[PDB]
Tab-separated table of C-alpha atoms in Angstrom:
chain	number	residue	atom	x	y	z
A	1	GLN	CA	28.808	-10.972	-4.605
A	2	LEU	CA	27.187	-9.416	-1.699
A	3	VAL	CA	23.673	-11.021	-1.235
A	4	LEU	CA	21.292	-11.200	1.334
A	5	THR	CA	19.319	-14.543	1.785
A	6	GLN	CA	15.830	-14.524	3.547
A	7	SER	CA	13.266	-17.055	3.835
A	8	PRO	CA	9.857	-16.155	1.992
A	9	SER	CA	7.450	-16.912	4.769
A	10	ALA	CA	7.333	-17.350	8.359
A	11	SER	CA	4.541	-17.952	10.852
A	12	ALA	CA	4.088	-18.208	14.529
A	13	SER	CA	1.179	-18.134	17.021
A	14	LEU	CA	-0.433	-15.084	18.492
A	15	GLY	CA	1.332	-14.118	21.723
A	16	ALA	CA	4.357	-16.340	20.933
A	17	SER	CA	7.884	-15.495	19.949
A	18	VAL	CA	9.505	-15.621	16.117
A	19	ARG	CA	12.959	-15.035	15.016
A	20	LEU	CA	13.504	-14.109	11.639
A	21	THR	CA	16.892	-14.825	9.798
A	22	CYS	CA	19.118	-12.774	7.360
A	23	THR	CA	22.174	-14.847	5.970
A	24	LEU	CA	25.036	-12.716	4.525
A	25	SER	CA	27.077	-14.302	1.552
A	26	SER	CA	30.537	-15.558	2.074
A	27	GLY	CA	33.052	-12.844	2.590
A	28	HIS	CA	30.879	-10.493	4.205
A	29	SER	CA	30.382	-11.802	7.653
A	30	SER	CA	31.341	-8.420	9.289
A	31	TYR	CA	28.510	-6.450	7.547
A	32	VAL	CA	26.010	-4.508	9.346
A	33	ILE	CA	22.466	-4.954	8.253
A	34	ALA	CA	19.355	-3.132	8.958
A	35	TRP	CA	15.494	-4.275	9.515
A	36	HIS	CA	12.701	-2.628	7.756
A	37	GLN	CA	9.187	-3.580	8.303
A	38	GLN	CA	6.340	-3.063	5.484
A	39	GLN	CA	2.970	-3.793	6.419
A	40	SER	CA	0.589	-5.083	3.577
A	41	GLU	CA	-0.047	-1.933	1.269
A	42	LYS	CA	2.069	0.601	3.250
A	43	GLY	CA	5.472	2.070	3.053
A	44	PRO	CA	8.602	0.634	4.913
A	45	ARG	CA	9.385	1.368	8.495
A	46	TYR	CA	12.971	1.014	9.711
A	47	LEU	CA	13.221	-0.984	12.949
A	48	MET	CA	16.994	-1.219	13.831
A	49	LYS	CA	20.455	-2.015	12.595
A	50	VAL	CA	22.408	-5.106	13.563
A	51	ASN	CA	26.267	-5.572	13.464
A	52	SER	CA	28.344	-8.403	14.427
A	53	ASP	CA	28.408	-7.383	18.188
A	54	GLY	CA	24.679	-7.585	18.051
A	55	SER	CA	23.804	-4.113	18.983
A	56	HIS	CA	20.977	-1.978	17.808
A	57	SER	CA	19.891	1.516	16.708
A	58	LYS	CA	16.106	1.266	16.917
A	59	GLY	CA	13.956	3.694	15.254
A	60	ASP	CA	11.605	6.260	17.191
A	61	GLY	CA	8.694	4.406	18.709
A	62	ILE	CA	9.780	0.550	18.091
A	63	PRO	CA	8.622	-1.515	20.972
A	64	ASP	CA	11.038	-3.339	23.351
A	65	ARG	CA	9.554	-6.716	22.199
A	66	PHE	CA	11.459	-6.074	18.909
A	67	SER	CA	15.183	-6.980	19.231
A	68	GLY	CA	18.104	-7.963	17.044
A	69	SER	CA	20.970	-10.327	17.249
A	70	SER	CA	23.833	-11.532	15.565
A	71	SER	CA	25.977	-14.732	15.180
A	72	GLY	CA	28.605	-15.339	12.145
A	73	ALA	CA	27.115	-14.418	8.771
A	74	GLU	CA	23.534	-14.643	10.034
A	75	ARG	CA	21.556	-11.691	11.297
A	76	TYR	CA	18.215	-11.982	13.414
A	77	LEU	CA	15.216	-10.452	14.188
A	78	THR	CA	13.192	-11.490	17.389
A	79	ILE	CA	9.769	-10.447	17.888
A	80	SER	CA	8.134	-11.445	21.275
A	81	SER	CA	4.396	-11.386	22.340
A	82	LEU	CA	3.393	-11.413	18.610
A	83	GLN	CA	0.425	-8.984	18.035
A	84	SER	CA	-1.784	-8.976	14.853
A	85	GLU	CA	-0.126	-5.759	13.836
A	86	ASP	CA	3.316	-7.803	13.550
A	87	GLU	CA	2.098	-9.402	10.451
A	88	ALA	CA	4.263	-7.823	7.816
A	89	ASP	CA	7.018	-8.197	5.311
A	90	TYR	CA	10.196	-7.988	6.909
A	91	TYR	CA	13.188	-6.892	4.716
A	92	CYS	CA	17.008	-7.044	5.799
A	93	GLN	CA	19.020	-4.573	4.063
A	94	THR	CA	22.812	-3.775	3.720
A	95	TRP	CA	25.185	-1.946	1.807
A	96	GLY	CA	28.744	-2.150	0.042
A	97	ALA	CA	30.789	0.409	-2.068
A	98	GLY	CA	28.414	2.305	-3.929
A	99	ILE	CA	25.304	-0.117	-3.824
A	100	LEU	CA	22.507	-1.124	-1.576
A	101	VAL	CA	21.437	-4.504	-1.149
A	102	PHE	CA	18.000	-6.053	-0.139
A	103	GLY	CA	16.985	-9.388	0.870
A	104	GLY	CA	13.843	-10.647	-0.728
A	105	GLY	CA	11.852	-10.155	2.444
A	106	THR	CA	10.216	-12.486	4.972
A	107	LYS	CA	6.476	-12.298	5.396
A	108	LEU	CA	5.267	-13.035	8.803
A	109	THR	CA	1.772	-14.646	9.398
A	110	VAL	CA	0.671	-14.745	12.931
A	111	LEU	CA	-1.811	-17.698	13.413
A	112	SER	CA	-5.038	-18.098	15.395
A	113	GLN	CA	-6.504	-14.823	15.989
A	114	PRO	CA	-10.106	-14.663	16.632
A	115	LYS	CA	-12.630	-16.093	13.881
A	116	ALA	CA	-15.133	-13.582	12.855
A	117	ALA	CA	-18.124	-13.633	10.627
A	118	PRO	CA	-18.511	-11.062	7.752
A	119	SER	CA	-20.688	-7.906	7.739
A	120	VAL	CA	-22.506	-7.410	4.531
A	121	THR	CA	-23.778	-4.503	3.041
A	122	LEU	CA	-25.582	-4.452	-0.493
A	123	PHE	CA	-26.247	-1.344	-2.416
A	124	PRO	CA	-28.642	-1.228	-5.470
A	125	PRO	CA	-27.856	0.923	-8.737
A	126	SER	CA	-28.125	4.807	-7.971
A	127	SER	CA	-30.715	6.448	-9.738
A	128	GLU	CA	-27.756	8.568	-11.319
A	129	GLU	CA	-25.930	5.478	-12.812
A	130	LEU	CA	-29.196	4.234	-14.049
A	131	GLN	CA	-29.494	7.634	-16.030
A	132	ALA	CA	-26.268	7.074	-17.433
A	133	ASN	CA	-27.563	3.748	-18.819
A	134	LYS	CA	-25.603	1.670	-16.802
A	135	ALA	CA	-26.114	-0.463	-13.129
A	136	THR	CA	-23.875	-1.628	-10.525
A	137	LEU	CA	-24.726	-3.734	-7.585
A	138	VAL	CA	-22.093	-3.230	-4.737
A	139	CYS	CA	-21.771	-5.907	-2.160
A	140	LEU	CA	-19.435	-4.805	0.585
A	141	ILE	CA	-17.989	-7.647	3.064
A	142	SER	CA	-15.956	-6.625	6.246
A	143	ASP	CA	-14.889	-7.735	9.559
A	144	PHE	CA	-14.258	-11.322	8.696
A	145	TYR	CA	-11.633	-13.756	9.853
A	146	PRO	CA	-9.811	-15.787	8.360
A	147	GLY	CA	-9.961	-14.134	4.842
A	148	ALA	CA	-11.525	-16.878	2.903
A	149	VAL	CA	-14.794	-16.374	1.454
A	150	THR	CA	-17.095	-17.136	-1.052
A	151	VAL	CA	-19.418	-14.766	-2.764
A	152	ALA	CA	-22.313	-15.790	-4.869
A	153	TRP	CA	-25.065	-13.652	-6.711
A	154	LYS	CA	-28.600	-14.553	-7.475
A	155	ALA	CA	-30.968	-12.963	-9.800
A	156	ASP	CA	-34.377	-13.602	-8.263
A	157	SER	CA	-33.378	-17.148	-7.320
A	158	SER	CA	-31.038	-18.091	-10.206
A	159	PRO	CA	-27.373	-18.203	-10.091
A	160	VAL	CA	-25.598	-15.468	-11.937
A	161	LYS	CA	-21.975	-15.490	-12.991
A	162	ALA	CA	-21.936	-13.318	-15.726
A	163	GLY	CA	-20.608	-9.791	-14.896
A	164	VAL	CA	-19.379	-10.410	-11.503
A	165	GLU	CA	-15.854	-8.995	-10.143
A	166	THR	CA	-14.837	-9.709	-6.611
A	167	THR	CA	-11.553	-8.398	-4.924
A	168	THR	CA	-9.236	-10.823	-3.123
A	169	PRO	CA	-9.557	-10.360	0.705
A	170	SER	CA	-7.338	-8.071	2.587
A	171	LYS	CA	-6.564	-7.365	6.173
A	172	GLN	CA	-8.003	-3.624	7.112
A	173	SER	CA	-6.747	-1.523	9.844
A	174	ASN	CA	-9.133	-3.413	12.472
A	175	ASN	CA	-6.867	-6.497	11.499
A	176	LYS	CA	-10.006	-8.234	9.977
A	177	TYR	CA	-10.665	-9.024	6.354
A	178	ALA	CA	-12.520	-6.906	3.723
A	179	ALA	CA	-13.601	-7.741	0.221
A	180	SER	CA	-15.950	-6.391	-2.607
A	181	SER	CA	-18.073	-7.950	-5.151
A	182	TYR	CA	-19.491	-5.840	-8.074
A	183	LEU	CA	-22.290	-7.295	-10.282
A	184	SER	CA	-22.490	-5.369	-13.392
A	185	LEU	CA	-25.839	-5.140	-15.003
A	186	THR	CA	-27.779	-3.373	-17.851
A	187	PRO	CA	-30.583	-1.333	-16.451
A	188	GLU	CA	-33.103	-3.226	-18.345
A	189	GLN	CA	-31.684	-6.629	-16.524
A	190	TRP	CA	-31.974	-4.472	-13.209
A	191	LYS	CA	-35.645	-3.813	-13.967
A	192	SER	CA	-36.576	-7.168	-15.122
A	193	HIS	CA	-35.958	-8.984	-12.046
A	194	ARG	CA	-37.981	-8.867	-8.942
A	195	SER	CA	-34.768	-8.888	-6.793
A	196	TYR	CA	-30.934	-9.562	-6.538
A	197	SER	CA	-28.999	-11.171	-3.867
A	198	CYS	CA	-25.408	-11.060	-2.575
A	199	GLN	CA	-24.568	-14.442	-0.984
A	200	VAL	CA	-21.434	-14.493	1.268
A	201	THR	CA	-20.039	-17.944	2.605
A	202	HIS	CA	-17.425	-17.873	5.476
A	203	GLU	CA	-16.639	-21.077	7.391
A	204	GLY	CA	-19.734	-22.894	6.333
A	205	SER	CA	-22.218	-19.925	7.203
A	206	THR	CA	-23.883	-18.005	4.677
A	207	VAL	CA	-24.735	-14.263	5.026
A	208	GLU	CA	-27.347	-12.938	2.299
A	209	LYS	CA	-28.754	-9.300	1.375
A	210	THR	CA	-30.897	-8.740	-1.315
A	211	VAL	CA	-31.930	-5.437	-3.142
A	212	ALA	CA	-34.927	-4.680	-5.593
A	213	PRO	CA	-35.779	-2.173	-8.226
B	1	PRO	CA	34.877	-8.110	2.133
B	2	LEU	CA	35.605	-4.620	3.901
B	3	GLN	CA	32.217	-2.943	4.126
B	4	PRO	CA	32.438	1.045	3.724
B	5	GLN	CA	31.420	3.784	6.192
B	6	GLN	CA	28.772	4.723	3.872
B	7	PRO	CA	27.805	3.254	0.387
B	8	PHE	CA	27.746	6.696	-1.291
B	9	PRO	CA	30.624	9.211	-0.402
C	1	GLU	CA	11.500	14.389	13.420
C	2	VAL	CA	13.054	13.586	10.035
C	3	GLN	CA	10.150	13.978	7.371
C	4	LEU	CA	10.560	12.887	3.827
C	5	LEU	CA	7.863	13.879	1.514
C	6	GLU	CA	7.478	12.822	-1.988
C	7	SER	CA	5.666	14.191	-4.870
C	8	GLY	CA	5.635	13.777	-8.651
C	9	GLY	CA	4.324	10.187	-9.387
C	10	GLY	CA	1.907	9.688	-12.304
C	11	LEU	CA	1.120	7.970	-15.612
C	12	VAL	CA	3.493	8.163	-18.184
C	13	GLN	CA	3.491	6.635	-21.726
C	14	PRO	CA	6.353	4.258	-22.551
C	15	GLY	CA	9.367	6.017	-23.665
C	16	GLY	CA	8.267	9.139	-21.726
C	17	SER	CA	9.639	11.185	-18.882
C	18	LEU	CA	8.971	12.067	-15.242
C	19	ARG	CA	10.704	13.734	-12.275
C	20	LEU	CA	10.070	12.641	-8.805
C	21	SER	CA	10.475	15.084	-5.803
C	22	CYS	CA	11.528	14.292	-2.289
C	23	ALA	CA	11.166	17.204	0.076
C	24	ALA	CA	13.378	16.713	3.290
C	25	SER	CA	13.115	18.499	6.621
C	26	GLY	CA	14.345	17.864	10.431
C	27	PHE	CA	18.149	17.445	9.630
C	28	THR	CA	20.801	19.126	7.632
C	29	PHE	CA	20.177	17.745	4.180
C	30	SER	CA	23.485	18.491	2.857
C	31	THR	CA	25.334	16.496	5.343
C	32	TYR	CA	23.892	13.139	4.191
C	33	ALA	CA	23.635	10.818	1.509
C	34	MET	CA	20.129	10.150	-0.104
C	35	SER	CA	18.855	7.201	-2.015
C	36	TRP	CA	15.827	6.018	-4.152
C	37	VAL	CA	14.059	2.792	-3.789
C	38	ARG	CA	11.440	1.142	-5.600
C	39	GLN	CA	8.795	-1.779	-5.464
C	40	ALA	CA	7.369	-3.439	-8.301
C	41	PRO	CA	3.600	-4.667	-7.835
C	42	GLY	CA	3.958	-7.644	-5.681
C	43	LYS	CA	7.738	-7.665	-5.485
C	44	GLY	CA	10.279	-6.562	-2.822
C	45	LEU	CA	12.542	-3.470	-2.450
C	46	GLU	CA	14.848	-2.681	-5.253
C	47	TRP	CA	17.626	0.099	-4.924
C	48	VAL	CA	17.529	2.431	-7.487
C	49	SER	CA	20.091	5.216	-6.772
C	50	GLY	CA	22.256	7.068	-4.266
C	51	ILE	CA	23.710	10.627	-4.229
C	52	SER	CA	26.378	11.938	-2.003
C	53	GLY	CA	25.498	14.844	0.359
C	54	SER	CA	27.379	17.231	-1.991
C	55	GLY	CA	25.604	15.936	-5.040
C	56	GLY	CA	29.256	15.172	-6.461
C	57	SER	CA	28.827	11.488	-6.512
C	58	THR	CA	25.955	9.610	-8.198
C	59	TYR	CA	25.213	5.809	-7.937
C	60	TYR	CA	22.773	3.642	-9.935
C	61	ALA	CA	21.412	0.075	-10.285
C	62	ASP	CA	22.045	-1.622	-13.515
C	63	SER	CA	18.573	-1.840	-14.415
C	64	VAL	CA	18.280	2.110	-14.505
C	65	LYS	CA	21.737	3.184	-15.254
C	66	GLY	CA	21.589	5.779	-18.303
C	67	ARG	CA	17.999	6.288	-18.215
C	68	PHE	CA	17.358	7.638	-14.551
C	69	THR	CA	19.421	10.470	-13.217
C	70	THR	CA	19.432	11.813	-9.678
C	71	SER	CA	20.310	15.203	-8.280
C	72	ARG	CA	19.592	17.386	-5.211
C	73	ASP	CA	19.025	21.009	-4.433
C	74	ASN	CA	20.845	21.487	-1.174
C	75	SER	CA	19.151	24.919	-0.614
C	76	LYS	CA	15.422	23.784	-1.046
C	77	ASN	CA	16.561	20.505	0.701
C	78	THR	CA	15.072	18.434	-1.864
C	79	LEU	CA	15.970	15.268	-3.595
C	80	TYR	CA	15.052	14.343	-7.203
C	81	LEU	CA	14.914	11.305	-9.630
C	82	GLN	CA	14.747	12.268	-13.219
C	83	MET	CA	13.285	9.475	-15.577
C	84	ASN	CA	13.716	9.342	-19.210
C	85	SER	CA	12.853	6.330	-21.596
C	86	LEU	CA	10.881	4.852	-19.207
C	87	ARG	CA	9.452	1.393	-19.808
C	88	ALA	CA	6.581	-0.744	-18.689
C	89	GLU	CA	8.519	-2.781	-16.229
C	90	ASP	CA	9.839	0.607	-14.214
C	91	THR	CA	5.910	0.840	-12.835
C	92	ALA	CA	6.358	0.781	-9.170
C	93	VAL	CA	6.017	2.572	-5.949
C	94	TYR	CA	9.344	4.704	-5.491
C	95	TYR	CA	10.575	5.741	-2.212
C	96	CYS	CA	12.882	8.061	-1.040
C	97	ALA	CA	15.134	7.164	2.031
C	98	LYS	CA	18.017	8.169	4.095
C	99	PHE	CA	20.307	5.373	5.031
C	100	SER	CA	22.724	6.519	7.568
C	101	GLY	CA	25.002	3.433	7.271
C	102	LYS	CA	27.502	3.304	9.932
C	103	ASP	CA	29.893	5.905	11.413
C	104	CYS	CA	27.025	7.447	13.190
C	105	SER	CA	26.253	6.998	16.741
C	106	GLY	CA	22.904	6.895	18.572
C	107	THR	CA	19.647	8.101	17.008
C	108	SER	CA	21.886	9.522	14.083
C	109	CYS	CA	22.210	6.078	12.939
C	110	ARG	CA	18.475	5.558	12.101
C	111	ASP	CA	17.298	5.301	8.651
C	112	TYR	CA	14.211	7.081	7.457
C	113	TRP	CA	11.876	6.417	4.501
C	114	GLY	CA	9.380	8.589	2.412
C	115	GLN	CA	5.798	7.595	2.053
C	116	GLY	CA	6.270	6.347	-1.762
C	117	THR	CA	4.602	7.498	-4.922
C	118	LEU	CA	3.214	5.437	-7.550
C	119	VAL	CA	4.650	5.574	-10.977
C	120	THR	CA	2.685	3.787	-14.030
C	121	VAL	CA	4.327	3.500	-17.381
C	122	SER	CA	1.499	2.395	-19.643
C	123	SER	CA	0.314	2.840	-23.342
C	124	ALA	CA	-3.424	3.218	-21.675
C	125	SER	CA	-4.599	6.848	-21.032
C	126	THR	CA	-6.182	7.989	-17.798
C	127	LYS	CA	-9.676	8.014	-17.000
C	128	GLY	CA	-11.119	9.932	-14.130
C	129	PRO	CA	-14.085	8.000	-12.276
C	130	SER	CA	-17.610	8.647	-12.314
C	131	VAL	CA	-18.848	8.975	-8.861
C	132	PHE	CA	-22.286	7.717	-7.770
C	133	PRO	CA	-24.051	8.079	-4.429
C	134	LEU	CA	-25.180	4.858	-2.582
C	135	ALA	CA	-28.395	6.063	-0.680
C	136	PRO	CA	-29.877	6.286	2.074
C	144	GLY	CA	-31.194	3.142	14.308
C	145	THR	CA	-28.027	2.991	12.059
C	146	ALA	CA	-27.722	3.387	8.395
C	147	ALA	CA	-25.007	2.726	6.036
C	148	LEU	CA	-24.485	5.340	2.930
C	149	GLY	CA	-21.649	5.577	0.489
C	150	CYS	CA	-20.063	6.597	-2.673
C	151	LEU	CA	-19.126	4.394	-5.784
C	152	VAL	CA	-16.046	5.540	-7.271
C	153	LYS	CA	-16.551	3.951	-10.804
C	154	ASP	CA	-14.057	3.167	-13.693
C	155	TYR	CA	-10.897	4.906	-13.271
C	156	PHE	CA	-7.246	4.389	-14.334
C	157	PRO	CA	-4.700	4.430	-12.714
C	158	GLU	CA	-4.407	4.028	-8.859
C	159	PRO	CA	-4.713	5.958	-6.605
C	160	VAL	CA	-7.966	7.521	-5.485
C	161	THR	CA	-8.616	9.212	-2.058
C	162	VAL	CA	-12.040	9.423	-0.503
C	163	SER	CA	-12.765	11.773	2.510
C	164	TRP	CA	-16.397	12.501	4.042
C	165	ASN	CA	-17.331	16.101	4.800
C	166	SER	CA	-14.048	17.135	3.868
C	167	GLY	CA	-12.681	15.170	6.775
C	168	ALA	CA	-15.312	16.117	9.694
C	169	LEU	CA	-16.526	12.478	9.388
C	170	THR	CA	-14.196	9.796	9.921
C	171	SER	CA	-15.719	7.844	12.761
C	172	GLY	CA	-17.304	4.429	10.811
C	173	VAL	CA	-15.783	5.332	7.480
C	174	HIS	CA	-14.469	2.365	5.542
C	175	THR	CA	-13.059	2.907	2.145
C	176	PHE	CA	-12.579	-0.504	0.479
C	177	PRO	CA	-9.544	-1.416	-2.045
C	178	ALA	CA	-10.593	-1.236	-5.532
C	179	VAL	CA	-11.510	-4.017	-7.986
C	180	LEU	CA	-9.428	-4.349	-11.002
C	181	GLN	CA	-11.973	-5.002	-13.906
C	182	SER	CA	-11.141	-7.038	-17.007
C	183	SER	CA	-11.513	-3.816	-18.782
C	184	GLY	CA	-8.680	-2.695	-17.163
C	185	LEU	CA	-10.413	0.128	-15.139
C	186	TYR	CA	-10.569	0.355	-11.289
C	187	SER	CA	-13.657	0.725	-9.138
C	188	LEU	CA	-13.880	1.194	-5.579
C	189	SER	CA	-16.425	2.123	-2.942
C	190	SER	CA	-16.541	4.104	0.525
C	191	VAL	CA	-19.104	3.611	2.884
C	192	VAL	CA	-20.043	5.328	6.367
C	193	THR	CA	-22.504	4.202	9.070
C	194	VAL	CA	-24.474	7.067	10.629
C	195	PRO	CA	-27.376	7.411	12.826
C	196	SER	CA	-30.834	7.217	10.990
C	197	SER	CA	-32.050	10.267	13.019
C	198	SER	CA	-29.402	12.470	11.489
C	199	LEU	CA	-30.469	11.647	7.753
C	200	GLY	CA	-32.817	14.728	7.701
C	201	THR	CA	-30.694	17.145	9.319
C	202	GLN	CA	-27.070	16.275	8.592
C	203	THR	CA	-25.667	16.480	5.046
C	204	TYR	CA	-23.146	13.822	3.851
C	205	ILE	CA	-20.679	14.623	0.982
C	206	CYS	CA	-17.999	12.159	-0.285
C	207	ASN	CA	-14.937	13.990	-1.574
C	208	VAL	CA	-13.480	12.132	-4.317
C	209	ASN	CA	-9.737	12.826	-5.761
C	210	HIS	CA	-8.285	11.197	-8.684
C	211	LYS	CA	-5.226	13.354	-9.388
C	212	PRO	CA	-3.932	11.380	-12.692
C	213	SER	CA	-7.034	12.937	-14.263
C	214	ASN	CA	-7.333	16.129	-12.493
C	215	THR	CA	-10.755	14.873	-10.979
C	216	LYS	CA	-12.066	16.401	-7.788
C	217	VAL	CA	-15.742	15.558	-7.044
C	218	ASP	CA	-17.689	16.508	-4.226
C	219	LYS	CA	-21.093	13.877	-4.258
C	220	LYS	CA	-23.848	14.591	-1.539
C	221	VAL	CA	-25.617	11.522	-0.702
C	222	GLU	CA	-29.221	11.889	0.267
C	223	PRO	CA	-31.924	9.421	1.482
């Protein structure tokens, strides 16, 4: 059975080195593998091939800090001076007669990037949406690190749970996290309160923005 | 064992 | 260099059919075997099919055998994946790819990937978004892209003239099963009276194309 075995997750410090491991099943120790990188919500990028004698065959523009190596049934990818952009899922891949085989992928986390407080923008319902007899409050949260946040909505000063939908935080191209929270209201609930607030808590500190009818 | 040159000849 | 450009993704009812295309360029297409790969939401890469350079030999993963067929046109330099009898669990981003194997030498041994296209198999029907302006020394303005299915939506500003300070957020998936997302751009307040700002929203599954002017 041609199988590639990869650990699900790995982590290392910013600026340090990490080696990821791909294990070939017994009877396939001579096989060539390839490493592919997939950043979250992107398509894969080929890195290199690794056969028994080590070797490479690097894709275009792959930095020198990416290298590969081999020993027995195990195939390695080593990344030095880790950068935030190296956070991705790394898949080894191989082939046999008439089939391709993928490992399960190893998700690499690069720890201890700078902490950053969130920027918050709160939008009220547009007049167009209100004329469609609906109302949405839009709370946009970006530039924070780490990616754990808590969002709390207030109608005037009272907590509001009903009608709240929030995304899970996701790392954007500036390598900081973003999330959004939506509060759905009827137009009459919107007009019957003096204000609504989006309250964002991150690392014990709370940012609040307020809009009014 | 014995990896072919190409999976899809 | 090598480019693999896919098209044809979309939404299909269970039991329905769909064909994906992968337009190749930058190499002698007919020389190389071509593959399809897929990735279900939150899962890893899964091999789908391979086809020899000539098209005479095809190979399929057991999960798709008999329902998916791969073919190629070596004059248009295009790879195809014909899907029939689609199932909910076939929902995935589909990638065309060129895996060189071994026997090659230097850069000829590189692998290449298409950009992927999303195929959704669901009994739910498509719904295009409603687009609302988010009014108004710097000011944030935006567009709310509300209640659509399925992904994806693309948003640009002033047809690509405005990119600096633009941030399009990942969509929320509401309990109703519809998505919403927002796009925001930060601009100088002094420009509000003189510069027009328009978000261009495209939801191909529903043939929706909206140009929404965002005024103060």
